[PDB]
């Protein structure tokens, strides 16, 4: 368990080697270095998990050095490992390793092979720093590194300026989230004097006995950082545009690393949120609203990868809903299962893109279950796990745990929102599946990760239980009758949604075309297609005034205001040079004028 820092050192070494290789090595050697760095990190993670379970699930601490020490400001470079950290670390390392083998197969013949693998290795190292840190500033280091690697990997095809614009939009929105997280850090250090998670939880109830308002501010700013990183309301607009990068980038961002950081942040600082119940209820409300908006947005997307992006937003909203109803174990279980099936879905969509030679929209496809049967099978099991198909998928058990935690804690409206979102999830998922893979046809390094993610997307993934006892509090248990009727309701809702998608899109689209061609239907489709106009609102409220103020200030008005005395001096000198006309009689006249002035002044002031 003393090799806990090796899970960061190996991806860092891979990034350094592949960055300084500069593409001069062979693609086999670059693939060996990158995939082997992430695989060795995963193997060290497996050994760490074996040691952790052999030691009775004891929280392990490994300091490395002291990051900074100015008086009472003490930030250490210390890693910690409990059940939550082990769960996130195993998910990140294993799913990133599978995505790395798929990228080694996928990115063959591309410019920037070594650069791609260096950036993904740095992404893995940053997320391991994020999940292994024991204080908020080291977690902020991992947070910002994850955001930077997201920016570097989204705009990987740098020749197209649209990819670059998507990368800058993702980085700017997540940077706003990180500024909110920085506000949380400043409040927590100013109040408690520490940023260590355990010490903050220990010192908070004694410090906030009289007043609790600054703790509410700190938890609200933590929620702001979380929704910035996890693409939730109101910082969700970056995800759909940021999907312009390569397919393994999207799999890594949406499944393993990038969007799970907010859920991990809320789960790690769960005690501080427990002392501020209104902010935790706001976390649940934000998750419910985000999942509903994301489901409605994914219902009308014409792109496979855009549907997958809004489905990721919906599932992260489900995780936030589980956090808000104090179902922490349900949230982490859904995080791990969603990582599995979302990685499977994104790799299958990349296989579709490579097979179709160009990124088509879903209506130009049809009858793809005959050209690619294995890709269709992977897509079918991934969509069944996404839609929470009962008794054969892990997503069903995860969403059942989330809804049971919501119902058992007295949150009825959040449970209703979760049920409606599950119905919509099955609706949009099998809408996209039936449009793409049904209709009339028009046009070892990768099978193994797809097979592993296929197996983990079934009930075998639900057989893996994260060791969250002793780290997160246990959710209040539901009665057997209530649990049974809730499982029945969830299965019925998912099956009815799949059947409605089959009735609407599997046959000829007549009632769907009747709805879409109607003026309310066109208006609602246009509204939901642009993700409810949030990007338009942020363009008209933040981007356009920024550009206008930059255009107004581009001539440096303060510089000209300070250049005004030079202009006045030049004008005064030119005006004073008129007296030097060279005329002697004027010089005598000016002498007599000065004599009059001097004598008059002397008689005045006497």
């Amino acid at each position: 368990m003393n090799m806990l820092a090796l899970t960061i050192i190996l991806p860092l070494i891979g990034f350094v080697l592949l960055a300084f290789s500069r593409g001069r090595w062979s693609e086999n050697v670059s693939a060996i270095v990158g995939v082997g760095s992430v695989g060795l990190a995963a193997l060290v993670t497996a050994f760490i998990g074996v040691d952790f379970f052999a030691n009775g699930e004891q929280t392990y601490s490994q300091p490395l050095w002291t990051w900074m020490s100015v008086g009472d400001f003490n930030i250490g470079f210390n890693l910690v490992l409990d059940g939550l950290s082990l769960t996130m670390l195993s998910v990140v390392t294993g799913v990133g390793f599978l995505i790395h083998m798929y990228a080694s197969w996928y990115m063959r013949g591309e410019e920037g092979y070594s650069r791609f693998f260096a950036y993904t290795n740095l992404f893995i190292a940053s997320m391991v720093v994020l999940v292994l840190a024991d204080n908020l500033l080291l977690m902020y280091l991992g947070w910002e590194g994850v955001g930077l690697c997201s920016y570097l990997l989204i705009g990987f095809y740098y020749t197209d300026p649209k990819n670059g614009a998507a990368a800058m939009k993702a980085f700017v929105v997540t940077r706003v989230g990180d500024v909110f997280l920085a506000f949380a850090l400043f409040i927590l250090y100013n109040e408690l004097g520490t940023l260590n998670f355990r010490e903050m939880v220990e010192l908070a109830p004694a410090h906030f006995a009289d007043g609790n308002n600054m703790l509410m501010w700190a938890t609200l700013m933590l929620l702001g950082g979380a929704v910035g990183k996890s693409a939730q309301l109101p910082l969700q607009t970056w995800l759909a545009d940021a999907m312009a990068g390569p397919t393994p980038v999207s799999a890594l961002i949406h499944a393993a690393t990038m969007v799970t950081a907010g859920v991990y942040l809320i789960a790690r600082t769960h005690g501080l949120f427990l002392m501020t119940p209104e902010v935790l209820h706001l976390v649940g409300i934000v998750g419910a609203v985000t999942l509903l908006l994301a489901g409605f947005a994914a219902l009308v997307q014409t792109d496979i990868k855009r549907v997958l992006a809004y489905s990721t937003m919906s599932q992260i909203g489900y995780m936030f809903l589980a956090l808000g109803v104090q179902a922490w174990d349900a949230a982490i279980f859904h995080l791990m299962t969603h990582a599995f099936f979302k990685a499977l879905l994104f790799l299958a969509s990349g296989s579709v893109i490579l097979a179709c030679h160009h990124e088509q929209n879903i209506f130009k496809m049809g009858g793809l279950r005959k050209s690619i049967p294995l890709v269709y099978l992977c897509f079918l099991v991934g969509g069944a796990a996404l839609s929470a198909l009962p008794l054969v998928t892990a997503g069903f058990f995860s969403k059942d745990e989330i809804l049971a935690g919501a119902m058992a804690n007295g949150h009825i409206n959040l449970m209703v929102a979760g049920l409606v979102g599950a119905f919509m999830t099955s609706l949009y998922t099998f809408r996209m599946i039936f449009i793409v893979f049904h209709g009339k046809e028009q046009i070892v390094t990768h099978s193994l990760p797809l097979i592993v993610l296929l197996i983990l997307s079934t009930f075998v993934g639900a057989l893996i239980v994260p060791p969250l006892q002793g780290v997160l509090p246990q959710t209040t248990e539901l009665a057997h009758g209530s649990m049974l009727t809730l499982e029945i309701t969830s299965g019925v809702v998912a099956v009815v949604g799949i059947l409605l998608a089959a009735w609407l899109w599997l046959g000829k689209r007549t009632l769907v075309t009747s709805i879409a061609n109607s003026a309310p239907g066109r208006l609602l489709s246009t509204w939901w297609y642009n993700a409810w106009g949030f990007d338009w609102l942020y363009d008209k409220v933040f981007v356009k005034p920024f550009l206008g103020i930059a255009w107004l200030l581009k001539r440096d008005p303060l510089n000209s205001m300070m250049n005004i005395p030079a202009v006045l001096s030049r004008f005064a000198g030119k005006g004073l040079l008129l007296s030097e006309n060279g005329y002697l009689r004027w010089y005598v006249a000016s002498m007599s004028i000065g004599a009059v002035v001097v004598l008059a002044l002397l008689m005045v002031l006497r």
């Binding site: 900074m68 020749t159 300026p161 940077r175 920085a182 440096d556 303060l558």
Partner: protein, 504 residues
């Protein structure tokens, strides 16, 4: 003891650079390299022998080394040098940047290279003397003395693609700004000395003696205003800033002049060493105005940097925004914010040095600085766009670089003192990420927007790559292990902070 040699080795080396040009045209660069290497080695020897990490705060004055000699005994003026942790860090940074400036102008085989090296050495010696002098007249003397070689370097050796008249205009504007503000500082120094003389009867310019000077409220405010006007011109603080982009634009193409005196931050040191201890009550009263000027400087510099089509002017306005952050840190009265300000000054020096060296080599390859005429340069160059990406990532304040450590300790201490200014400054960090990403997108990503950007370009030299990678290593080590730097400056920062808050 070694402090006069720390000042005098640059001046003697510059004289030898000018004189030894008769033996060859490639001779003065070796003399300048030996000179700045010796100065850096002496500074590192002072760092090792000083024992700064074990030094505790004993109150102002507390000097780890001190030198005194009479200069003008009629006014009580002495060549009076003193070094402690903050001064030592600034002197080490000056020596390192001088070595980088010598190496950056290695390939210039001009017929008057000896005078170029003499001017560079005299600028470096003046900056070291500014950091070392604790005599008010000597401090002013070095402050104004290091501006004449800089004027002649900008006006005569400057950006050769531009017209001569633009170079003379930029050099004249820089000289007028700096020297007029210095004259205002001289008036403040003279009036403080006269107040001390009328209260004591002793002709002194010693900063240790002027610390305990009984002043009326309002007189102290005016003396503080004169000092702050000088330091605000050379920080820069808005609106006394435009000389810095005009001087960076018309600096010589290598970038050695950029590293020599335009980039070393003597004004924040002067604010910490002189403005706060001499006038603590006036600084405490001036604090809201100073932190709001810092906020305006952060956002104005960020917006100006975004609006530039010139990459050099973008880096200059980046420096303006960072100095707004440091100016906020100085007036908080917090130990954490002061240590963050020290880290931020060192990190800004390293990162801006890397950015200016990379900009100079980019201009060497492509013969233009307009970002509208480049684009997609990642595929055309071997090393330059990746290192430019690293340094632009550093200047937006990425953790792992020292800029993050500096600005975040600044913001932690400032939030402990003033929360609203802190939250506005963090949104300034969002603005910083915006302008750094904009520069990276406009320069190295996308498609080629002209003909010169569409051709393959020669790779960087081994020496150029060596010093850029040295800056990269130093920035990463400052990001991950800033504790030696924090321990070096801890006692001086503690003395300044205790003097500031124990007399208000």
């Amino acid at each position: 003891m070694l402090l006069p040699w720390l000042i005098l080795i640059p001046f003697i080396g510059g004289f030898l650079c000018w004189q030894t040009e008769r033996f060859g045209v490639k001779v003065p660069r070796w003399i300048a390299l030996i000179t700045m290497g010796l100065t850096l080695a002496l500074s590192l020897q002072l760092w090792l022998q000083g024992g700064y990490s074990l030094t505790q705060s004993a109150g102002i004055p507390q000097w780890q080394s001190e030198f005194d000699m009479p200069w003008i005994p009629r006014f009580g003026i002495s060549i009076h040098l003193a070094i402690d942790g903050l001064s030592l860090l600034m002197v080490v940074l000056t020596g390192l940047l001088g070595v980088l400036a010598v190496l950056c102008s290695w390939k210039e085989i001009e017929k008057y290279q000896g005078f170029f090296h003499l001017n560079l050495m005299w600028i470096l010696g003046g900056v070291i003397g500014v950091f070392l002098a604790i005599d008010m007249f000597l401090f002013f003397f070095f402050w104004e003395m290091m501006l004449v070689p800089m004027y002649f370097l900008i006006a005569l050796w400057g950006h050769k693609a531009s017209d001569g008249k633009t170079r003379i205009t930029a050099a004249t504007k820089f000289f007028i700004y700096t020297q007029a503000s210095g004259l205002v500082m001289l008036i403040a120094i003279l009036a403080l000395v006269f107040v001390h003389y009328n209260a004591t009867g002793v002709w002194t310019f010693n900063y240790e003696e002027l610390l305990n000077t009984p002043m009326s409220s309002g007189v102290e405010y005016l003396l503080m205003l004169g000092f702050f006007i000088a330091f605000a011109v050379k920080m820069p603080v808005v609106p006394l800033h435009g000389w810095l982009p005009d001087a960076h634009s018309q600096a010589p193409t290598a970038g050695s002049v950029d590293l020599a005196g335009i980039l070393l931050k003597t004004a924040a040191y002067g604010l910490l060493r002189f403005s706060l201890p001499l006038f603590p009550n006036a600084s405490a009263e001036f604090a809201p105005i100073a932190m709001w000027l810092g906020v305006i400087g952060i956002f104005y510099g960020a917006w100006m940097a975004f609006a530039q089509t010139d990459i050099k002017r973008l880096i200059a306005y980046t420096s303006v925004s960072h100095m707004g952050f440091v100016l906020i840190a100085i007036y908080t009265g917090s130990q954490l914010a002061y240590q963050g300000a020290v880290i931020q000054m060192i990190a800004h020096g390293l990162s801006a040095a890397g950015l200016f060296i990379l900009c100079g080599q980019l201009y060497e390859r492509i013969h233009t600085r307009d970002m509208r005429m480049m684009g997609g340069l990642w595929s055309k160059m071997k090393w330059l766009p990746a290192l430019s990406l690293f340094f632009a990532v550093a200047t937006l304040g990425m953790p792992g670089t020292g800029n993050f450590v500096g600005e975040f300790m600044i913001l932690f201490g400032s939030f402990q003192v003033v929360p609203v200014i802190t939250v506005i400054s963090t949104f300034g960090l969002v603005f910083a990420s915006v302008y750094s990403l904009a520069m990276l997108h406009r320069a190295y990503f996308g498609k080629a927007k002209s003909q010169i950007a569409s051709q393959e370009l020669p790779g960087m030299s081994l020496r150029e790559l060596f010093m850029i990678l040295l800056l990269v290593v130093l920035l990463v080590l400052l990001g991950f292990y800033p504790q030696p730097i924090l321990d070096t400056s801890h006692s001086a920062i503690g003395n300044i902070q205790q003097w500031f808050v124990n007399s208000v």
